[PDB]
Amino acid sequence: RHVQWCTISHLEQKKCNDLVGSCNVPDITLACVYRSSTENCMAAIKDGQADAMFLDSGDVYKASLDHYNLKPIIAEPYSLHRELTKCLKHRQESLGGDKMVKGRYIPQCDEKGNYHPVQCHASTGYCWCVNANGEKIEGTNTTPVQTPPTCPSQVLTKCLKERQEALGGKAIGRYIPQCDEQGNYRPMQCHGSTGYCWCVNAIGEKIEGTNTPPGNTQPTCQSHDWDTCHYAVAVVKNSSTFQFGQLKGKRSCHSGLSKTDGWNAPVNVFVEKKLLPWDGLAKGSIERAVSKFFSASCIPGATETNLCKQCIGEEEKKCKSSHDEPYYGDHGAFRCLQEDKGDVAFLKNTALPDEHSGVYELLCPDNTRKPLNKYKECNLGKVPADAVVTRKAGDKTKDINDFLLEAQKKKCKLFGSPHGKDLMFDDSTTHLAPLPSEIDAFFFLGVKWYNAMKALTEDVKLPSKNKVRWCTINKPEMMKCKDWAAVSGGAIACTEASCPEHCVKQILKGEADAVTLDVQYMYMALMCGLLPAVEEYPNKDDFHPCQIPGSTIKDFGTKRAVALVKKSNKDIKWNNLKGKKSCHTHVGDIPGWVIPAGLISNQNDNIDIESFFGESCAPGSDTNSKLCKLCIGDPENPSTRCSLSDKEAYYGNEGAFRCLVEKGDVAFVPHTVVFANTDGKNPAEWAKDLKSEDFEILCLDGSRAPVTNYRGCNLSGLPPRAIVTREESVSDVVRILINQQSLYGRNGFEKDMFQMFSSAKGQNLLFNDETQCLIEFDRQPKDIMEDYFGVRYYTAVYSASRSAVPSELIPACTFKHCSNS
Ligand SMILES: NC1=N[C@H]2[C@H](CO)N=C(N)N3C[C@@H](OS(=O)(=O)O)C(O)(O)[C@]23N1
């Protein structure tokens, strides 16, 4: 196995070569491939000449475009503010679940708020071991007849672990971190031999401008500092006197034309403060406008002559996006100021001097100057993280990740070099971790910075708030949507995706505005931050809420999942169904499977629903399992047993009810099944005038009730399907859809011209055909998860937790960003 790293300079190639020799990672060999600039390396990776390189966030954006098609895969983790510990958040969530779902696991947290390594389930007496995330170590479960297991101690905090590593078993003459009671870094740190002291934030990162030799006064160190994003800053010497608003005509040093801290951040501020006569691509390029602002600068990668005048690279290396240009990068821009080739340098806080005293200070955009350690209040914005990138195909992602993980475990010299600073990686980097598997530049940079960088390259025409771009998931839906657009007078437009999850992505990225989602997709949609705008109201009995919008809805009419049993079986209750014979509509059905399996796993330590029951019939299971012993199959024996078709006699709503009456104790079905197949409503012989009063439903409290009281004695009611959109577009989508519905709904004024809830092109296109109307979602002041799902469903299916991962999109769309207001 090989990893080919692309280097951009003679110096970087030298450092990469040293690592080939010094860093011994078994199974994976590092190799180094030289190119003359950042852009030539991005092309080498696209072409397969190399596999990986580390990019500034600005280049991560550029590399994500179709010319290169690269994606970020590895980066240093950062924090925005202090958060609750995971155990305490989990406790709060589980305690907020539906109390009618009894016997649920409530985590046990220790005096620091972390998980006790031994976790126990009070209602079942089972205990197990967990990792620091509170996730069960599989295979450690012990029954209550046994003593609690012996579980390894918690992994130490960063500070306590670095302290243990610094001691290394018996220390003298080296820095040993000082930790607080909670195991985080004390704000002030001192070197036990040199007498120097400095400040660190809560995860131990040094605050620049605070390093203090012994015998001098230290700057005040801020406590509980969990803001670890990097900040773009403008650095100047204290010997000059101009302010930020007088930058016109000065000399400047920039980390690079494509760097976020050296270009996007200052240019964004220049434009907002109207220092730069530029607003759109009608006034030419921004680089040309910047060329007229400064008298002479060094901006590696630039083409304008005066913007390369201050660079000192020799011959063709001059003004290159490469360390062979001595003023390239954060530390090159600072050197350019230090050597008086510029009056101001644009870089980020992590490249500022560590020492408190000296001739440098910060140039604030509010026309003041402030000391180096005040960058959090004297900056040009937070900037995104930087990242290792590879091809979008990801053919080398695993080898790249494995090599860097092992190299860091072995403490290879990745993050420094005698040859120079910020070679291969930023010298300030301490750890590189894998990004979410579905991350891309949009989700890595965040929508605010992604759009901000795009705005510098093109005039982004923001779509109209009077048009709803509807996302369709198949060709018939696209065609029905084009007919809607033709009658809509411009209110409706159409986009195409392959599946509802890709529609959610389009809405997040501003390519579409709305889509209707099945219940099985709403957890993902809500975790990515979309909101229900309107919902499909399916109650055929009551049309009052459709005629008079905003009025009270007595019954929304969604299905209720119930546990159906016979009146003769007096001994069966909810709490004793273990080992009994059950009948499910099919695997994957929400009322017949997802809701029952969710409650069973919630109350029995995630024990398989296959193992919970004795002999069941659930179409879709393995034919040899206990879940297919009850399944008959085709009465016209061909074997089509336990099959997901009508060939199975026990398939579907009617089939699961047949399984109950013929050979079962309980059936998991919607509440409408028993009424639609008893009282002689089904002509077949198996239900020869079967009586509805012959059956009852099981309540979660062990009691029972007649099938008529399904509203108060059910496993869970389902939420309605929802039309989702971005938070800032809810009001527009509601307004446009309600107006369209007054024209083309079931009582629309122009329903002869178009019908939203039917089509000759197919069934359930865009909306479900049995929809009565769309009802505005009335957002309540509570968690959107509980608001949309209802507490019962939220608890039964997701344990009332925001930590479930039913789609691998969730870790990417919840990745946190370094954005400004
Ligand atoms: N805001 C809000 N309006 C309701 C409508 C349905 O009537 N849409 C939902 N998805 N909901 C879930 C229900 O929850 S439940 O607990 O009543 O089942 C609810 O009635 O609260 C509701 N929440």
Numbering used by the authors: 5 to 174, 177 to 644, 647 to 829
Task: Quote the study on this structure.
Dinoflagellates and cyanobacteria produce saxitoxin (STX) and ~50 congeners that disrupt bioelectrical signals by blocking voltage-gated sodium channels (NaVs). Here, we show that American bullfrog (Rana catesbeiana) RcSxph and High Himalaya frog (Nanorana parkeri) NpSxph sequester STX congeners using a ‘lock and key’ mode shared with STX. Importantly, functional studies demonstrate that Sxph ‘toxin sponges’ reverse NaV block by multiple STX congeners and detect these toxins in a radioligand binding assay (RBA) used for environmental testing. Taken together, the X-ray data and MD simulations highlight the structurally rigid, pre-organized nature of the Sxph binding pocket and identify a shared set of protein-toxin and water-mediated contacts that engage diverse STX congeners having affinities that vary by ~two orders of magnitude.
To visualize Sxph:STX congener interactions, we co-crystallized and determined the X-ray crystal structures of NpSxph:dcSTX, NpSxph:GTX2, NpSxph:dcGTX2, NpSxph:GTX5, and NpSxph:C1 at resolutions of 1.90 Å, 1.95 Å, 1.80 Å, 1.90 Å, and 1.90 Å, respectively, using molecular replacement. GTX2/3, dcGTX2/3, and C1/C2 are epimeric mixtures at the C11 sulfated position. We found that decarbamyolation at R1 (dcSTX) and alterations such as carbamate sulfation (GTX5) at R1, C11 sulfation at R3 (GTX2/3), combined C11 sulfation and decarbamoylation (dcGTX2/3), and combined carbamate and C11 sulfation (C1/C2) shift the apparent melting temperature (ΔTm) of both Sxphs. Carbamate removal (dcSTX and dcGTX2/3) reduces binding by ~1 kcal mol−1 consistent with this moiety interacting with key STX binding determinants Ile559, Phe562, and Pro728 within the NpSxph binding pocket. C11 sulfation is uniformly detrimental, causing ΔΔG changes of ~2–3 kcal mol−1 for GTX2/3 vs. STX, dcGTX2/3 vs. dcSTX, and C1/C2 vs. GTX5. Notably, Wat795 shows lower occupancy in the C11 sulfated toxin complexes, suggesting that part of the affinity loss caused by the sulfate modification derives from its effect on water occupancy at this site. All structures, except those with C1 and GTX2, revealed a third water molecule, Wat786, coordinated with the Asp786 sidechain and the N7 position on the five-membered toxin ring. We observed nearly complete neutralization of STX, GTX5, C1/C2, and dcSTX (93.7 ± 6.2, n = 5; 99.2 ± 1.4, n = 4; 90.4 ± 5.8, n = 6; and 88.3 ± 5.5%, n = 7; respectively) and partial neutralization of GTX2/3 and dcGTX2/3 (53.2 ± 9.5, n = 7; and 59.9 ± 7.0%, n = 7; respectively).
